[PDB]
């Protein structure tokens, strides 16, 4: 039987998601066993550090990703303040919401392919190891991912990094 | 104490959310307890016939609403297609996706308030009695419902019951 560690070596370019359900685990357990070069995982604890970061990257696609729906939205993340027990946004570009501040207990930098191209993403996870949400950075004229967010997204990757 | 059916009838102005959580049960448990006042029910085979005509209504609010977050998006509904098992809309003005429309089984129109602000609100709801997503309806400068889209609601709730 094929572990899961060893099919994602093989660089799988489906959804993750259908993955996790192969082999009847949660997202959070697919990718704590993806490849290092292909992710680099952080503590929930960082989120507001992760969050005002990307707030200044521009335009990019937050996700909602369940089996009865799946939401995106092309925006310049909203920043936010906190207050109650929420993350409370304050978006003027059609995005904006509430966060629960405790749900957030792990986030995931990862690039891989999808369907054949190039993918970067930001996956915020809460206790039972289900995404909350997934941030993905936009691409250029060439169809490549735009290089000035990699960049962006491959520091602040690496500072989560002890 | 108070039973949920009680609670909602002292009319309470958090989210139904919270008290689907007070009474560890489904967001669907809760709607259906709602006075009929205030709740109008259709199966999930209305959805196309509901999406469609909300489709024309202006910018409105699609929610994602679960126990980690809430995310709103706002926009005129995109269309939608059925295709591959989902109903899958076409980018436009930002929002896109693909929705599990066979999976919704009941669709709920609400029209209650929170922290006494008045809002309406379209629920898609999972066989599991929870939210797929929900819609809410848009606001005027000062943040008033819509007349012509609270009129329009009020007129699709009734056609389907």
Not at 15 to 24: C, F, M, R, V, W
Not at 121 to 146: E, P, T
Request: aromatic share 10%; with cysteine; proline share 2%.
């Amino acid at each position: 039987t094929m572990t899961l560690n060893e099919l994602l070596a093989t660089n799988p370019d489906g959804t993750l998601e259908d993955i996790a359900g192969k082999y009847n685990t949660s997202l959070f357990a697919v990718v704590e066993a993806l490849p290092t070069a292909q992710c680099t995982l952080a503590t929930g604890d960082r989120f507001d550090q992760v969050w005002d970061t990307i707030a200044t990257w521009g335009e990019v696609t937050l996700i909602s990703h369940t089996a009865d729906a799946i939401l995106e939205f092309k925006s310049e993340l909203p920043t936010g303040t906190h207050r109650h027990g929420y993350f409370n946004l304050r978006g003027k570009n059609g995005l904006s919401g509430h966060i629960r501040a405790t749900s957030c207990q792990h986030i995931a930098f990862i690039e891989r392919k999808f369907m054949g191209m190039d993918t970067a993403s930001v996956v915020f996870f809460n206790a039972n190891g289900a995404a909350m949400f997934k941030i993905f950075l936009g691409r250029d004229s060439h169809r490549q991912l735009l290089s000035a967010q990699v960049d962006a997204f491959r520091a602040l990757a690496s500072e989560l990094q002890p």
